[PDB]
Structure formats: structure tokens, C-alpha cells
């Protein structure tokens, strides 16, 4: 309807873009929630993976909510979607639950690097300032994290060392 | 398949009620997540309505999380479904906000009690114990709490009286 | 004349246009310092009002100054010009000052955007990565405040309630 | 218009004289400011010189502040006008920016004067000793500094002798 | 050889760009390291700018290790080369060695305005946001001050005064 | 040229074999630099080994700047030559890099007991002082605890067990 008294160089595509956006890091919280608790479970009982993972899920959250926050300040309207459950709910061991976790966060920088293209082509500085400055070094360092677990939990004979793992959980995680 | 090592008088209509539980407090969170941003936008504007459904809906994660947890306490296997997105976009008002929060914690309530009524059938103590005394008073405080902001609302000139919904918002939710 | 020893990759027109971003500051800061003492009056006596201009007249001189540190910074020579005096010696009621306030911002915020614009078309990424810094999403939060209090003051029943414009006062400039 | 309900002894011509003293120490701060960028230019580089007149300029922004703070005291109602930009873009040396300091100081005293002997002219005591109070004898020691810096600086070699200005700079404002 | 499980957007020139940048910072710590060193001699004897030398020596090597850091963050591999001796034995005076440390940082500075070239015209905003928020102001801090000195060194005397090299070496630097 | 006001019972063979050990101690720094990036690899991982190696480079470098303080001390000349980059660019595993400091210091003791016994049968006593004093047990140490520590990497099963390395990492260097 009407334009929001704030609205000024906010492109109608920025806008859509970051409620799109809103919803994939929703979605990254509740992958990191369901990993945790499938590392709770008694069968698997990994209890620093849990941590590390549930950590995980409450910073999407927040990554979610700064996004939300912005398109306030910018004068767009949130547009909320479903957020849909993850595509596994048994994560196989800490390896495969790394892997997936990294595959994730690449796919989330792909999406904020595409909306950073966006936000360039409509000639949104302050946009792109945001994106930097919030998300693209957090993505950057996150998914070095993950390839450095990755890497040491290979090493160490994951997944078929249930010895390596329960020692990653103890020495890395924990 | 095969038995959980700690399952012990757990019905599987229980495990599946309990999953159905959880989406509910993670979609209660949604929403509540929901109305916080429509009081953070800049032609509504009151910013402690925002934080008071801001903290209910980390609360709800909260109550989501508990029965994830207890789920692998008692040796079920938590199913995750999409979290489906609040019926409304724009919630109108102050008052119509706490007034759709009262509806959502009578229904989150009559859910709990249907759950109390099938652990009560399967004679699950332990389940009604941890009914009762994470959830069911939980829910009547929210209530009755709910209850007092759409009274003091209402006689305060709510909704016609932005002048009443700024004070409300100072005075009792600040 | 000759150059500045320490000048690069700054071109004039980037030069000329942060001697005229700087009297705009400064005109910022004479608005404010002019609604500031309008609320100030016996006649209109609203004293958190005054307060909350007067400081938002001492941050527009601040970023004035950083304007010129940023100038010699980079080898340009500051050229300082007349700053015009206010539209309005009365800005008539709270509401009103703070609708002319977020006109004014809105328009520097232009200005700061059109800045950028060129100095992305000088491919000077440090004057880009300064405004980004320092002053666009300054631009964005004082936006969106001023938003939020032009709505409340409307929703309050501002300005023909004498009543409103107090409470305002009080409560959230107070 | 209609009187202020607070106004008494106070003449229209005494209204007058204090807005145009207003204007003056606005006009003053803006010189300050103008000088002390010039001595954080890299080519002049004297960043005591730059803080000692950056100070002076804040100071004249209080002086301003507090006669429009006086005027509506006493019922007048402010008047301002645009602030001239400072004769001088470049003020040679450590030396001439002091002497110019200090026929600048001279003026808004030989103003203050003037001022004073309408407020006796016109009977008001309350006036005679606002400006005795806050600003006559502020003006004497402004002076007073001033002449001695230059004196000083003259005594040392200055303006030929960069070493002078240099080793003023660490000593006496430093 | 196969691709990083971290790499995403991160072309090939721009890792080689990061391995030149990277013996560029390196070859700055060991030009400020022969500086300090000079004025450590006891036909020399300043040891406020051998101090000041040291720690920018220091602080090079400092900004090398940040993009050796940032190579593996995306993914890249580092690939060093021989650090080239300085210029210069001996720096002549203090005088001539802030002037060539000063054309040592704006030849590392167009380095790295061509290294955000390169990674605007490959679309990489992590790696623009890395330069412009570690470097770029780095850069134009240490360009203004280097002129600073220089200039206060000139007008004090230097070369010809070893007077004014101490005074300055005390004063300035100390 | 003339000589050094300082300079006594200091041979220019012994100024000559400084400046050489000079140079080999920056490339023991480099070589230490290199070997710590590569434990931060993604691929490889080990971030204790990454921080050992980093302040072993650091340590490198002090030694260096000790032997360019005595080259004053005595009133020799510093000449400084190219720091070579390292023979490797990737350092196999924990194990192969161990090894190779350990070659590294043991050819940084044989060039410090070549440099005593220059020093010896020049008769200066100054300088085998020196030497002994703080280098010849720093090297005894610093090849001890390598040896020490290719034993352990060894005897854990070290470098086809990536646990032994893992386990290397966070209890010894850890
Ligand atoms: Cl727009
Ligand atoms: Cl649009
Ligand atoms: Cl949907
Ligand atoms: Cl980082
Ligand atoms: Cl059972
Ligand atoms: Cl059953
Ligand atoms: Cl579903
Ligand atoms: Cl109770
Ligand atoms: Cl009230
Ligand atoms: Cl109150
Ligand atoms: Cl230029
Ligand atoms: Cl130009
Ligand atoms: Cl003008
Ligand atoms: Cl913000
Ligand atoms: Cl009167
Ligand atoms: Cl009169
Ligand atoms: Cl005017
Ligand atoms: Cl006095
Ligand atoms: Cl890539
Ligand atoms: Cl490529
Ligand atoms: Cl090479
Ligand atoms: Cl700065
Ligand atoms: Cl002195
Ligand atoms: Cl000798
Ligand atoms: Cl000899
Ligand atoms: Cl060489
Ligand atoms: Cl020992
Ligand atoms: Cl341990
Ligand atoms: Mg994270
Ligand atoms: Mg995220
Ligand atoms: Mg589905
Ligand atoms: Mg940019
Ligand atoms: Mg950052
Ligand atoms: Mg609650
Ligand atoms: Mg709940
Ligand atoms: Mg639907
Ligand atoms: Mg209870
Ligand atoms: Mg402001
Ligand atoms: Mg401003
Ligand atoms: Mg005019
Ligand atoms: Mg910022
Ligand atoms: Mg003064
Ligand atoms: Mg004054
Ligand atoms: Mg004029
Ligand atoms: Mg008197
Ligand atoms: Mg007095
Ligand atoms: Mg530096
Ligand atoms: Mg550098
Ligand atoms: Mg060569
Ligand atoms: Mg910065
Ligand atoms: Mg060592
Ligand atoms: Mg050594
Ligand atoms: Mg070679
Ligand atoms: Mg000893």
C-alpha cells in the first residue's frame, strides 16, 4: 500500500529478497536444532556435538531476527513462510552431521552473496554494508570451521571410529 | 525398529503426541516472533510490546526444547515437521495482538490437557509429572496474564485510543 | 596548487562534493540547535523536546568534523561555505518539529547516497568503505527513530492534544 | 505578537542586540573550527595549535547556547541568521592564526560593550549583570592568553621559524 | 590440485593478488626493520624513531599474517617467495627515512586499491569488505601521520638541522 | 670508512659472520611462518601446531633483532640480504614438519658454533660471551624439545595415525 515515511533507495526486489532470506536462516536454526537433539539421543550421546549444534541453532535465530530488524529500518514489510523441517531427521554419526552442517552453510553464503549482488546491482550501499559487515566474514568463518572439524574428525577415522568421534566430542567440542 | 535401551512404560501414542507437541511450542514461538516485529515497525512503533512478545517467543524455543529433551529421556525418537507460518501478517493493534496471544495459549493449553488426558490412559506418571510441572501452570499464569493486558486494554480506550496502547506500553509492559 | 603528499586516488570531484556534505552537516546542526530552543519557549515549555534536539544539534557537529579529518585525511583542502540559517524560526508544535526533522534527515541521507554514488564511480573504495562506516546506517537508525516518533505522536492524538505532546515528553523522550 | 507572560524590563532593542550576539559567537565558533582543520592539514601538521582552537570553537558554541537560552528566560524570542563563513581559508601559520584569534576576540568584546551600555541605556540590571558575569571578564582573560601566545610565538622567531612553532606547540599548548 | 571443501567464490587471480599482497607486507616489515636498526647506530643515535620503526616493522608483519590467515579462511593456498632486502643500507637522516617510509606506504596502499579492483571485477564482496576494514583506512592513518612528520621535520630544520632531527625525535616521537 | 668511535677488538670477519647469521636467523623466522600456516590449513587443521610454529617465528625474530643490537654495539655495520623463502610451500604432517625444524635448528646451532669459533680465535671475549649466553642453550633446548617431541609423534603412530597427530596437538602443544 502506501509507502512506508522511512522507505528511501530500498528496492520492491530488495525487500523480497531479504524476507526470503529471513526464512533460510530460520531454516539453518531448526537443521541445528534437530542435529543437537539427534546427538542427545541415548543411542548416540554425544553430548558436546549437542551443544555445539544447539549453539548453533540459537545464533541462526539471531542472524534471523537482525534481518527481520532491518527490514523494519528500511521501511519493508516482513513477509513470513513456513519454515520447513530439515531433510533428515538421523544425522548418522559427527561426521556426517559436519558435512551436512557445512553443506548448509554454504548454501546460506551462496544466498547472502546473491542477495550482496542484489543489493550492488539496485545501488543499495547501505544494504551492502549490512550484508558485509553481519553476515559475509560470520559465513566465511563459520564454514571454515566446519571444514577444519570435518577435516579432523577424517583423520582421526570417523565415521568408523566410534572412538574418534566420542575423543573430538571430548577434545574439540568440549 | 529395534527397542530403545531406556524405554521403559512408554506408549507410542505418547512419542507421537509429544512430537505433535513440540511443532506446536516451536510454531507458538513463530508466532510470537511474528507480532514482536509487526510493534518494531515504524508506523506501529511500540517498542515494548515488541521485547514483551520478543521474550514470550524465545520462551516458546524454550518449551520446545524441554520436550525435544525429554523425548530422548524416555527413549522416543523426536519427528520434526515444518513450522508453519502465523495466520496473520499484520496484527492490527496492541489489544488485538494480546487478544490473538490469549487465543494461542488456550489452544497450547487444551493440547497440554488432551497430552495429560493420553499419558493418564497409558498410565504414564512420569509423563503427567512432567506435564504438570513444566507445562500446566506455565500455561495458566500465561493466561490469566493475557487476560489482565486485554482487560486493562479494553478500559483503557483500546483499540481507538492510540494515546491508551502507548501508556499500556510504558507503564505495564515497560 | 601542488598536489598533497599524501593524496591518492582521490579525485576532486570526490573533494568538492565532501566540502559540500560538510556545510550540510553543519546546516543539520543549526536545525536542531534552532528546534532545540523552540522548545525551550515559555510558550511551549516541553523540555525533553529541547533536550533531544539540542543533542541531535552536537552529533551533526560531530559528524561535521569527522567530514573534515576525512578531508585532510586524504590531501584535499577544506572549503568551508556560509550555513544558512533555518527555514522556520517556529516549527509549531512537537509533532511538526519532528516530521521537519525526519524530512532533513531523509534529505542528507540523499545527499550521503549520492556521495557514495560517486565515489564508487571514482573506484575510491576507502571513501565508500568511510561513508558506509561512519554515516549510512547512522542515517538509517536516525531515520527510523524520528519514524517512530512521528507515529506515536499521531497515534497520541499530536498535535491538537497539548496532553499527547507532554506525555511524549515524558515518557520516551524522557 | 502578544507579550510573553514572562517578559518584564525587557526592551525590544535589548531582544535585538542579543540575537545579533547570537549570530556572533556562532560566527566565532565557525572561525575556530575553521582554524583548527587548518592545522590538522598535513602540510601544517600542529595538532596542539588544531585541539586548542578546536576547544575555543566549542566554547563559542556554548556562549551561543547560553544567550539563546537567556533570550527566552526573559520572553524574547530568538532570531537567527545564516552563520558567515570565516574571511580566511588558509591562515598561514601557527602566529597569524593567533593574531587573528585575537582581533576576533577583540570585536566580540568591543560587541559585548555595546551591548552592555544598552542594557544600562534601557535600565536593566538583570542584563548588565548577565554579561558581567558570564562574559565580560571571559572575554579579558581570552584576551589576555591570546596576547600572550602571540607574544610568545613573535619572541621565539615565529613566523619564520618553523622550529618555533613546532616547540610553542609541545610547550604552551601541548 | 581438487578444489577446497571451504572454497566458494574465490577466483584464482584474487588468490594470487592475496600471495603477492602477503611478500608486499612482508617486504614493509623488513624496510622498517633496516630503518629502526639505522637509528640504532652510535653515529645515528635517535632511538625514538628506532622505536617507531620497530613497531611498524612489527605491525607489517602483523598485516602479512592476517592475509595468510585470510587465504586459508577462503580456501586458498599460500605460496611465499624470497623477501627482497631493502633499498637502502643507510637511510641518511630522520628526515629521509619517514619521507621513504612514506613512499613505502603509498606504493603498499596502490597495491591495494589494485588488489579491491580486482576483487570488485570479480564480484567478491567478502574479500572488498576484508581490504577496505583491515587496510584501507590503515593505510590512509599511516600515509596522513608520515606526512605529518615529514612536513614538521622540514619546517623544523631537518636535514641540515641535527638539532631539530633530536628535538623532533623527543618531542614528537618520544 | 673511518671507524666506528665504539669499535674495539672487533674483527670485520666476525662483523661479516653476524650479518650472515642475522640473515639465517629471519629465515629460520620465515621458515617457522610458513610451517605455522600450514597447520591452519583447512585441510590439515592443527591449531596447536599452527600456534607453536607462529611463536617459534616470533621467537626467530627477537634472536634476530639481539644480533642486529650487538652489530651496533660493537660499531659494526648491518647488511642485510634477501630472506629466503622456504624449501617448502607444504609440510606433509605434523611429524615431517617437526623433523625439519629440528634439521632447521641444528644447522642454526652448527652456523652459531662456526660464529664461536671465529669469535675464539679472534680473541674476543665479548662476543663468545655473547653467543654463549643467549644462544648456544637456547639452541640446546630448542633441539632437545624437538627431539622430544619427534619420539613422542613417532611412538603414538605418527603420520598415518591423523589421531596421533590429533592427540599430539591438543596434549602436548595444548
Ligand atoms: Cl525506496
Ligand atoms: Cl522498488
Ligand atoms: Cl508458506
Ligand atoms: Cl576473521
Ligand atoms: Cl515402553
Ligand atoms: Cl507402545
Ligand atoms: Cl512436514
Ligand atoms: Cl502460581
Ligand atoms: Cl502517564
Ligand atoms: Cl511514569
Ligand atoms: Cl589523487
Ligand atoms: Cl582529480
Ligand atoms: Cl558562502
Ligand atoms: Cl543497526
Ligand atoms: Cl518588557
Ligand atoms: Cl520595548
Ligand atoms: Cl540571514
Ligand atoms: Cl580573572
Ligand atoms: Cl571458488
Ligand atoms: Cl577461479
Ligand atoms: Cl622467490
Ligand atoms: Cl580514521
Ligand atoms: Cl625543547
Ligand atoms: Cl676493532
Ligand atoms: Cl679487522
Ligand atoms: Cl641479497
Ligand atoms: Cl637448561
Ligand atoms: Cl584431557
Ligand atoms: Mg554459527
Ligand atoms: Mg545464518
Ligand atoms: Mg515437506
Ligand atoms: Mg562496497
Ligand atoms: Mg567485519
Ligand atoms: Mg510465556
Ligand atoms: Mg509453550
Ligand atoms: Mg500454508
Ligand atoms: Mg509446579
Ligand atoms: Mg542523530
Ligand atoms: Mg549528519
Ligand atoms: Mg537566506
Ligand atoms: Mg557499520
Ligand atoms: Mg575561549
Ligand atoms: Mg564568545
Ligand atoms: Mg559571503
Ligand atoms: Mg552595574
Ligand atoms: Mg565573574
Ligand atoms: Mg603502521
Ligand atoms: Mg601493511
Ligand atoms: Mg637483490
Ligand atoms: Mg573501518
Ligand atoms: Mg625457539
Ligand atoms: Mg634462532
Ligand atoms: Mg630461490
Ligand atoms: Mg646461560
Known sequence: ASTSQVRQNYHQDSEAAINRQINLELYASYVYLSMSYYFDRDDVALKNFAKYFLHQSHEEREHAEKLMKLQNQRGGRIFLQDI????????????????????LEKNVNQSLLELHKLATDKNDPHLCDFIETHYLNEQVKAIKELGDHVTNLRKMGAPESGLAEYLFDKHTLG
Open 84 to 103: 520447513k523441517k530439515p531433510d533428515c531427521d538421523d544425522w548418522e554419526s559427527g561426521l556426517n552431521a559436519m558435512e551436512c552442517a557445512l553443506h
